[PDB]
Structure 1
Amino acid sequence: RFLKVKNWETDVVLTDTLHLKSTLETGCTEHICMGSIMLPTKDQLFPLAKEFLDQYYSSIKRFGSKAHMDRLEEVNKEIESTSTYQLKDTELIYGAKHAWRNASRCVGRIQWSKLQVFDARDCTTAHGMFNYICNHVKYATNKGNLRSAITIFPQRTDGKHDFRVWNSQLIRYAGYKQPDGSTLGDPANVQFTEICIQQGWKAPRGRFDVLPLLLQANGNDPELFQIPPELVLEVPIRHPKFDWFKDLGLKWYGLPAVSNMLLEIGGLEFSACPFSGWYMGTEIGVRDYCDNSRYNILEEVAKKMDLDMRKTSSLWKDQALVEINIAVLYSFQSDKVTIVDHHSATESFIKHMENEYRCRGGCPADWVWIVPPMSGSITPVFHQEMLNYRLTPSFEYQPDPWNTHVW
């Protein structure tokens, strides 16, 4: 019940006590582990509020103070009266920073406390949402000196007035199915790219077309907006040794900004809460470029390198994969855009674990997602035992809106 985790490369052992505060469930049982599965009222709400406020007031060292008791009572009264409640600004920021802190799949959490929270709870329309989002993008981008941020739109009420951003990221490339059978641009976004045109977008049918935003305010029909290009920082991808690289026509965007998640704080559900940080290089180079169900460029790069692609055991895929990722990091760094390599990021995460075990009694972590998708065992997280559990406040998945929207 007071659990141990061993690093197998360094024999370092940490004792986890924090897992006992785990509220939600994991998908696993004593009979089956689901560690690798992608996605396993008034009386409900007051305990949720209390749990949160208790941890809030404990974090500011006023646990069991008049302030605490008062606030606890204040919210208690509000729930009984309004069937919900509102967070003080301070709680909103605390909650968001902590939802990031508790995200077990996130390798970048060492930065958790330096998050800029933009309070967008006074927003009422989709045009307003657009303004807030452009402001977020411009701030976070910061001319390539990236800064973490989240913009928080109003909380769910009766579930009929939901704020939602339909894009999965604020900035993604469009995906169109060709008559010739293959796919142009990004296959992952084919369906969304449809629903854009299907809602009125005029698609340039190019390879790297920044998709428009599809913003839904107060449960209304969602609207289309084009992010000002001057706000969308992009990086043309070149290799520091292969001059033919450029002619592949590859570029990627600087700002990774997840927008389809649900932020949960003290029982409250913020269904529109786009958040951004900066890329780890492998996210673009390994996953975005080389996944079979994505830009799938391996064969072409390898051809250009004149590699023996006859037998899998020449490791030509591996050889190219490395070069591609050297180029991604190279380009980004050249153009002075923030990026981190998987070696540096994983090392920072280990340090972050140390700190969390030391000052918080633990750090929930999902090994399947923390270990980078290349060179797994030459990064230190590979050899690091991790305990995965769910703490709140949290970010959670939610259904795509098109499947849900009462049109």
Structure 2
Amino acid sequence: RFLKVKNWETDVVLTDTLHLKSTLETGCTEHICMGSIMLPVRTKDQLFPLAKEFLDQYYSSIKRFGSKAHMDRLEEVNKEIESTSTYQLKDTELIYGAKHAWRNASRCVGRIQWSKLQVFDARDCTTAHGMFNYICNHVKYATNKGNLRSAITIFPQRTDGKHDFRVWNSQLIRYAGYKQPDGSTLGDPANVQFTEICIQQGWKAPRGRFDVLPLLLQANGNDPELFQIPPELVLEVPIRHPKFDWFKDLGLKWYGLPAVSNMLLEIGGLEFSACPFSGWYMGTEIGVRDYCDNSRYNILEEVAKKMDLDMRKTSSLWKDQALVEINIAVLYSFQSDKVTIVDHHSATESFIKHMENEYRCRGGCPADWVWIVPPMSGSITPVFHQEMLNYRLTPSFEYQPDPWNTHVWKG
């Protein structure tokens, strides 16, 4: 079957056939659309089909489908599964699998870059100290003194689900949040519970507004351990505005490396529960979401105060005005310090080009409109006007429960 999507700005119509290779479920039915829902131990029986499907994709991609090498690899994996109940990926397969999980990530606007991903194979890791060393190396490599390079580090796969590797941090680099007795929050309100966990584990908290959190690392199902990333490895950007000289005195900064560390990478039915990955920022992630969400740094009022905007009625659009100025500041600051960043106009235009190329060469590009459209200035970006089809392909990145909710404490 064929499905069409239209761009309502250009009248360009694309035809999706790739959705036919979709296995996982969306959450939607013919009677309900769950498109705006945020969050909607394997046996041998379920594993060989998943392995076979993956290896068929891999071998097609290298133009060796049905070759002796393809057939021998199927037989070898087959035997490994029946005898050991799992299997190991070849290095080439791991790399392919990680690149494809990114390519298939329908909530990611940055996918034009998918084929340029440095993969660090950390499957020989055994301890939390080992994980710390791997993660420092990834941070240093990815940071590259401001010239950011995409990377992912992949720790050993799940076995019985009792021996999981996990990074407890939601991102490798984030700021602490501290709930005060008066109910106000110092730092990032998103990180309060995690900060509290770190403190209980023995972290000495400086208790400021931008304290970089320690890494909390779990190897082989053991209790997690704390490590401080060397500060010289944490690139940060002080935020200033090109025209407003008082902007610097708001005391804002942000880190340059966006690096998600709490997702699960599935490749050929194997589950990599610790697979931190990083790219570079789109400005709005910081300027809109991190700074201006009511439940995050919430700076809108203080900025608009300083700008002397009319704040007595929402219809003056003071919030919208202060919002644009903050986002100008973020982009100006990163550019001035030569730290890679992309604005939402550039990123969305590139995404449309990527999506069109994917339809031509791949037969489709699963995309989640709710996530792809930037959180300011939606309709003056081309993605707002682009119909998208959302479906799930593997290899993939998936959510998983927070480890403090499930971990069996050893003591």
Per the normalisation by structure 2, the TM-score is 0.99
- Structure 2: runs of 5+ lacking an equivalent: none
Provide the residue aligned with 2:5 in structure 1: 5
Provide the residue aligned with 1:252 in structure 2: 254
Provide the residue aligned with 1:20 in structure 2: 20
- Structure 1: runs of 5+ lacking an equivalent: none
Shift, 1:257, TM fit: 0.3
Shift, 1:5, TM fit: 0.4
Deviation sequence 1:152-185 (CA, Å, 0-9, x none): 0000000010000000000000000012221000
- Once residues 124 and 364 of structure 2 are traced to their aligned partners in structure 1, the CA distance between those partners, rounded to angstroms, is 36
Deviation sequence 1:258-295 (CA, Å, 0-9, x none): 00000000000000000000000000000000000000
- The RMSD of aligned alpha carbons is 0.4
Provide the residue aligned with 2:245 in structure 1: 243
Shift, 1:202, TM fit: 0.4
Deviation sequence 1:120-149 (CA, Å, 0-9, x none): 000000000000000000000000000000
SS of aligned partner of 1:244: helix
- Once residues 141 and 8 of structure 2 are traced to their aligned partners in structure 1, the CA distance between those partners, rounded to angstroms, is 41
Provide the residue aligned with 1:101 in structure 2: 103
SS of aligned partner of 1:209: coil
- Once residues 382 and 193 of structure 1 are traced to their aligned partners in structure 2, the CA distance between those partners, rounded to angstroms, is 36
- Once residues 149 and 127 of structure 2 are traced to their aligned partners in structure 1, the CA distance between those partners, rounded to angstroms, is 26
Deviation sequence 1:236-257 (CA, Å, 0-9, x none): 0000000000000000000000
Shift, 1:389, TM fit: 0.1
SS of aligned partner of 1:264: strand
| Match runs of 1:295-310 below 5 Å | 295-310=297-312
Per the normalisation by structure 1, the TM-score is 1.00
Sequence identity percentage = 100
- Once residues 176 and 266 of structure 2 are traced to their aligned partners in structure 1, the CA distance between those partners, rounded to angstroms, is 30
- Once residues 13 and 227 of structure 1 are traced to their aligned partners in structure 2, the CA distance between those partners, rounded to angstroms, is 48
- Once residues 336 and 348 of structure 1 are traced to their aligned partners in structure 2, the CA distance between those partners, rounded to angstroms, is 21
- Once residues 403 and 223 of structure 2 are traced to their aligned partners in structure 1, the CA distance between those partners, rounded to angstroms, is 11
Deviation sequence 1:188-237 (CA, Å, 0-9, x none): 00000000001110000000000000000000000000000000000000
Deviation sequence 1:8-35 (CA, Å, 0-9, x none): 0000000000000001000000000000
SS of aligned partner of 1:359: helix
SS of aligned partner of 1:5: strand
SS of aligned partner of 2:341: coil
SS of aligned partner of 1:389: coil
- Once residues 355 and 348 of structure 1 are traced to their aligned partners in structure 2, the CA distance between those partners, rounded to angstroms, is 11
Provide the residue aligned with 2:224 in structure 1: 222
